Paper text:
SIDT1 embedded in a GDN micelle exhibited the 2D averages of relatively resolved transmembrane helices and we successfully generated a reconstruction of hSIDT1 to an overall resolution of 2.77 Å. The lipid-like densities were inserted at the cytoplasmic side of TM region. These densities were fitted to cholesterol molecules and Mass spectrometry analysis identified cholesterol in purified hSIDT1. The two densities run parallel to each other in a small concave formed by TM5, TM6, and TM7 at the intracellular side, which can be modeled as cholesterol molecules. The putative cholesterol density which is better resolved than the other (CLR1) is located on the opposite of the homo-dimer interface of TM5 and fills the space between TM5 and TM6. Another cholesterol molecule (CLR2) is packed with TM5 and TM7. These cholesterol molecules were surrounded by hydrophobic residues, most of which are conserved in mammalian SID-1 family proteins, suggesting that the cholesterols serve as molecular glue that stabilizes the conformation of TM5, TM6, and TM7.SIDT1 is previously reported to bind cholesterol via CRAC motif16 characterized by the sequence (L/V)-X1−5-(Y)-X1−5-(K/R)25. On the extracellular side of the TM helices, we detected density that would be assignable to Zn2+, being tetrahedrally coordinated with His563, Asp574, His791 and His795. In the cholesterol-bound form of SIDT1, Zn2+ is coordinated by the conserved three His residues and Asp residue, in which there is no space for a water molecule which is activated through the coordination with Zn2+.
Residue numbers in the entry:
A (entry chain C), B (entry chain A): 44 to 275, 283 to 332, 444 to 528, 535 to 648, 681 to 825
């Protein structure tokens, strides 16, 4: 039977009958026409469904209405409205116009008969345009896909999909032009690149990875939300999701060289400003072998994760900030690796400042008027700043749950090395072995990895950790040891307020909770050392006084950017994608990349406080005050 | 048109016609009947394929003949013979006999017409029997699946699939009874448990994980071999694979307690035999903090791999010996973990022997006639034997490429600690710090992980490693240092023969190649120490003479079982499954589990040689010979 588009056909079909509708149209040699088939059936007899077969010249497509889904824990779902878009055949100038037939056959095995309703339409907004937002609606029985053609200017696009409600859970997939299109639950992750999505998604593509410089963008809704965060609305027989897709061209290669030269010439401006004021006046092996032995678990691991996300299309592994992930060859986020250049550049500059202070100290001993200068741990800290950037750049190749500590765990060593040197400046009788720096670092990683996994924010771990936190502060207070007893009980109250804050709220990101312990204890013992210099008759020279004000304004700026989370391994990867944000600096760097820039500067100026604070006493002779 | 089973129907179909065959049969209320549909088409016009639709009461099934496949690097394959088995509806005593209809519709859009051939048969050997081997043949366009029903006796079965040729690459899947059965390339890994397979497969199942105590065993052949080892025969239009499946009941729970009590009472017999001869006569903290800091990368990792293989059905991750993998709760191979009990039991016994020798040494100093007894590294070795079993049991939770070293890497530390104590017995002036045991261990792990990955068996790594191996032996020879010069050049020739053996063959398993360096250098310097005692006038007491003969017969037995590989992370998981073997001891332990038993005994008796070799000189007074 010859039928018409945009007309709703209704009928009844039983075991003897089979309705056949033949649809006939013509494809123009430049535009593309997509056909969608709508089938209803308001028949709840689920022992005799309505079977619908759609035949084309080169394909056959079949489904049953009502569509059935088997969820977890033995739950069944019905869907009385099924919609499928047939794979379009594109006519070109080598072919001309093409007359195409489509046969739709409706059949059922019910003895009494089953009622249905059929509608076949041509899609008008099938081809997506560049930088134009397009709104549509999908369903677990009504998947959608659209076409995007690459312009000759653009070589890389980003597919930004936005939804204002977290549920139903969905899948956004990118596939080839070659038929068939996989738009069902069991085949959408077969080939192509896909992402799970509750509220946001972002897929970055290259023009060189597609033959005809075109792809399909497939939208499939899931019947349950177990792959996403939740589980299982006024009689939700249909799990409709309102989506909005925008295809934005990526940044050009001039942004790759303008932003990379920024991240070098900013930290090389520290080199020029250091040798200028040098012109005006005109254990490290131990910490590297801790670093590279702690590192090699992730080099053996993140090169497998970065390949699995590339040889498959499973982009649910590596937890990036997908709205600010700029690839370079194999790496999928080059800006997260390039932003750690400030650690290895300012950490190398701090070694050249100590080496200038060490050569000009041995040349003065060949020809007492100060505290004994010990440049041992100063070499140990500038190395530890350099190894912090190497460890965290390896984390950002594929951030996930199995390497989460490697963003900031080596900063516990840096904060531990700073509090030991500040104790060493007026207690030179200490002797910390190279094993003790390895063993005390190994027990603060263990309790971190455990807290996040086993602790799993339960009250059994948080109480006994709060007891460890309050007796550690009670041990270091009298070890440091009359206004001396006044400061040594204020600093316990800051650690006690820190202990009960994590006890009543239980922050799940325990690796960032351990940073707050090591930073505030650093910024208290450094703050108590200045007040002890000012309660005595000791002034502050303008060179350390600049570095104290610099340390306070760079740590307050870095701790602001530290709290804007743009990714989270704590939940599902679709839950982490809801917090993705665009780049805010030079269209290359997000909030987490400025934290890599400003925590390498705040730790550098914290080093320069510990080096030049006691240069008041380099003219005051010894046997005066300790 | 009413049609008959086991009859070949042939016809021609064009755009106007559509042949319809109706098949009618009856299902008995205890047996099960499966229907298979065979379609040929010897028409190479691939612009107008033959479309075949099979309609049942509750399902619709469609495909096109010739079937098309898109391989990697733009290769297309045709298959002119397609065969599908329809999902059977089981009749029970609550239903009685069931009259079932099957409609087969053949259609094509060719203008001239397309020829086909149709055959519809009932499967006779559809239900698999227990402990009966069954041979069949499959194809990439002709998948197969069968039914297995659990007996009331059996609670766990193993599905052993055997093929005598490695190619074509295949997939063996286990699925539920609820229709549809996923037997195509794009849906066979959707739900259920699956395994890739070239030559062998073994899937262990529980009765409690299936609702009706029955499952389907799906066999799907792949169009290419890229997921397996190879790639892409006399005009192989069909990639036929001859398979053979056997379903064997698992071992009972009495085997779980008979084999576990064996592995305790054997190593507790060493305790009873030690205190009996004690009745006849009637740095460790440093090595644990090396161990648990080296361990915590895998506890954060293998608990994710063991869950992913459980929450999905991807059994291509954990590289077990699947023919000797016996589960216990969450773990999928309990015998690989239980076999490491000999390390923690014989390592704890060695500490109690040294502690008995240490308490009876301090009690003798309160009341010279020997070499100075130093029990420092003796505590360090018995701890290192205990931590070797903890590290390798964590490896066998999920062995793969990301944790491969943790089977045997801590034995490099054990062999290194033995060669240092044997140097210490007649050179007591040595002072090896606790950091130097950590730093020298960290550089032999680095060069191992690298050799396996980057080295990747290329000549650029193997030449420069052979140069490191020959100057290390040239450094330790004169450090040990006239028949003394005779032995110190024979031991270089064993290291030189070891250097060129790995250079001309390039063993890819470099972690086992590093074991051969550390073991032979241990078994040479221990062998040279006995000859130096016998070239002088020093006898051997019967207690160390028993332990020397015990060390030689337990290391020769353990190195035999070390070379029978039953798994390999070097290739694809389907390539590793070809080397799986059945258990040889108590139906619980394979060849790799006896290596865990005999290398904990050979290392224990190697400890007892180093402890009691110099008990000749405990009656000879000092100032006699060094
Ligand atoms: C397939 O054949 C058609 C028919 O020739 C091609 O369409 C033609 O494309 C050219 C190039 O874009 C058009 O020229 C343009 O005309 C506009 C005026 O509208 C002018 O402003 C531009 O500067 C340019 O000269 C031409 O009008 C257009 N003709 C028709 C009838 O559409 C088409 O490009 C061919 N496609 C391929 C892939 O070869
Ligand atoms: C299968 O059944 C469903 C529901 O019975 C049909 O959906 C209905 O579609 C019509 C036409 O698109 C909708 O009517 C119009 O809706 C707009 C938007 O709300 C409204 O502004 C108009 O005044 C008009 O009522 C109708 O609302 C919609 N029903 C629901 C519940 O959303 C569907 O069309 C059926 N499929 C076929 C092939 O017949
Ligand atoms: C569904 O109904 C049929 C019909 O009764 C059941 O078949 C019957 O099953 C019993 C138990 O296995 C059979 O008894 C056995 O007979 C053999 C002699 O062949 C004897 O050696 C055994 O000791 C036992 O007594 C019985 O013969 C058999 N009857 C028929 C006609 O097959 C069937 O078990 C029912 N299924 C379910 C799931 O309830
Ligand atoms: C589609 O075409 C293929 C090949 O043209 C058909 O396979 C052929 O099936 C027949 C009957 O099963 C085979 O004949 C018998 O084979 C056995 C085993 O070799 C032999 O011992 C007998 O003497 C007899 O020849 C025939 O060998 C086989 N052809 C090949 C190349 O294996 C298939 O049956 C066709 N499908 C339909 C539905 O007609
Ligand atoms: C359902 O099947 C029956 C027979 O199995 C058919 O019923 C038709 O009913 C109309 C109205 O009474 C009459 O023309 C005949 O009794 C039947 N027509 C034919 C052509 O057999 C029919 O196949 C189905 N009924 C429908 C589609 O309404
Ligand atoms: C689909 O519709 C078109 C018309 O839109 C049909 O084309 C006509 O075909 C007849 C017979 O070949 C010609 O006499 C007419 O002149 C054609 N009209 C046009 C506008 O081209 C076409 O045949 C239809 N397809 C089928 C399969 O029937
Ligand atoms: C192919 O289609 C044509 C028409 O499009 C039909 O050809 C038949 O040929 C036979 C033998 O010459 C004659 O009975 C008629 O010319 C046609 N029969 C009918 C019923 O139209 C037929 O549909 C197809 N040919 C086949 C199946 O052989
Ligand atoms: C399938 O075949 C069976 C016979 O094997 C058919 O059963 C017959 O049905 C007619 C009409 O209802 C009865 O008069 C006969 O007595 C039945 N015979 C038997 C042996 O049961 C059955 O009708 C067929 N199915 C269809 C849909 O035609
Ligand atoms: C902070 C971590 C990550 C890095 C390691 C630095 C800290 C923890 C290390 C380095 C120097 C070490 C201390 C040096 C000296 C002493 C005094 C001794 O009587 C007990 C151990 C103790 C107290 C050491 C253990 C902890 C210590 C303070
Ligand atoms: C994070 C680390 C660096 C903690 C900072 C404190 C370090 C640098 C200093 C501060 C006070 C010091 C302690 C002061 C007093 C004692 C008691 C003495 O019998 C052994 C050393 C010991 C235990 C010192 C170890 C090092 C120490 C703990
Ligand atoms: C074998 C590995 C895995 C475990 C570590 C044990 C070995 C390698 C360690 C422990 C004792 C160490 C040696 C002890 C003393 C010396 C002499 C000194 O002048 C150079 C370093 C050197 C040579 C040390 C480095 C290597 C050494 C032999
Ligand atoms: C795997 C490890 C234990 C190697 C075994 C050899 C160890 C135990 C012994 C054997 C000979 C020893 C060396 C003999 C001579 C020297 C030269 C001296 O100026 C420094 C120590 C040094 C370098 C010794 C270090 C320890 C040493 C290397
Ligand atoms: Zn970071
Ligand atoms: Zn092992």
């Amino acid at each position: 039977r010859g039928a018409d588009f945009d007309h709703v056909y209704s009928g009844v079909v039983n075991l003897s009958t089979e309705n056949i509708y033949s649809f006939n149209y013509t494809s123009q040699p430049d535009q593309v026409t997509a056909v969608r088939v709508y089938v209803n059936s308001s028949s709840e007899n689920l022992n005799y469904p309505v079977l619908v077969v759609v035949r084309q010249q080169k394909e056959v497509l079949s489904w049953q209405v009502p569509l059935l889904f088997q969820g977890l824990y033995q739950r069944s779902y019905n869907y009385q409205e099924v919609s499928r878009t047939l794979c379009p055949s594109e006519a070109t100038n080598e072919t001309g116009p093409l007359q195409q037939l489509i046969f739709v056959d409706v059949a059922s095995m019910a003895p009494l008969g089953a009622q249905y309703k059929l509608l076949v339409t041509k899609l008008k907004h099938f081809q997506l345009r560049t930088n134009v937002a397009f709104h549509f609606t999908a369903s677990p029985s009504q998947p959608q896909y659209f076409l995007y053609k690459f312009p000759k200017d653009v070589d890389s696009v980003i597919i930004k999909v936005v939804s204002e409600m977290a549920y139903p859970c969905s899948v956004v997939s990118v596939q080839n032009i070659m038929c068939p299109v996989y738009d069902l639950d069991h085949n959408v992750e077969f080939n192509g690149v896909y992402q799970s999505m509750t509220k946001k998604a972002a897929i970055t593509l290259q023009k060189k990875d597609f033959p005809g410089e075109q792809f399909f963008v497939v939208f499939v809704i899931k019947p349950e939300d177990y792959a996403c965060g939740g589980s299982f609305q006024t009689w939700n027989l249909q799990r409709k999701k309102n989506l909005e897709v925008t295809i934005v061209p990526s940044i050009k290669e001039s942004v790759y060289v303008k932003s990379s030269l920024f991240s070098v010439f900013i930290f090389l401006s520290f080199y020029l400003g250091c040798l200028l004021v040098g012109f005006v006046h005109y254990y490290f092996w131990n910490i590297i072998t801790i670093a590279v032995f702690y590192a090699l678990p992730v080099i053996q691991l993140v090169i497998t994760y970065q390949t699995v996300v590339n040889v498959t299309g499973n982009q649910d592994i590596c937890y990036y900030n997908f709205l600010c992930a700029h690839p370079l060859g194999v790496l999928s986020a080059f800006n997260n690796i390039l932003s750690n250049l400030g650690h290895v550049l300012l950490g190398f500059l701090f070694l050249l400042i100590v080496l200038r202070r060490d050569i000009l100290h041995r040349r003065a001993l060949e020809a007492e008027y100060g505290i004994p200068k010990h440049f041992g741990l100063f070499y140990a800290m500038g190395i530890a700043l350099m190894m912090e950037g190497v460890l965290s750049a390896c984390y950002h190749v594929c951030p996930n749950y199995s390497n989460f500590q490697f963003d900031t765990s080596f900063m516990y060593m840096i904060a531990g090395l700073c509090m030991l040197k500040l104790y060493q400046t007026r207690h030179p009788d200490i002797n910390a072995s190279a094993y003790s720096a390895y063993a005390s670092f190994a027990v603060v990683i263990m309790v971190t990895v455990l807290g996040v996994v086993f602790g799993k924010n339960d009250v059994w771990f948080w109480v006994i950790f709060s007891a460890i936190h309050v007796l550690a502060s009670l041990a270091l207070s009298t070890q440091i040891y009359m206004d001396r007893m006044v400061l040594l009980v204020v600093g316990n109250l800051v650690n006690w307020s820190f202990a009960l804050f994590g006890l009543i709220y239980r922050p799940r990101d325990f690796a960032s909770y351990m940073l707050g312990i090591f930073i505030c204890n650093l910024l208290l013992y450094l703050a108590f050392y200045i007040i002890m210099k000012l309660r005595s008759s000791e002034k502050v020279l303008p060179v350390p006084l600049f570095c104290i004000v610099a340390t306070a304004v760079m740590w307050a700026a870095a701790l602001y950017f530290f709290f804007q989370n743009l990714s989270s391994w704590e939940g599902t990867p679709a839950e982490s994608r809801e917090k993705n944000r665009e780049c805010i600096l030079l269209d290359f760097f997000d909030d987490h990349d400025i934290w890599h820039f400003l925590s390498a500067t705040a730790l550098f100026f914290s080093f320069l406080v510990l080096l030049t604070l006691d240069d008041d006493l380099d003219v005051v002779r010894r046997d005066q005050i300790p």
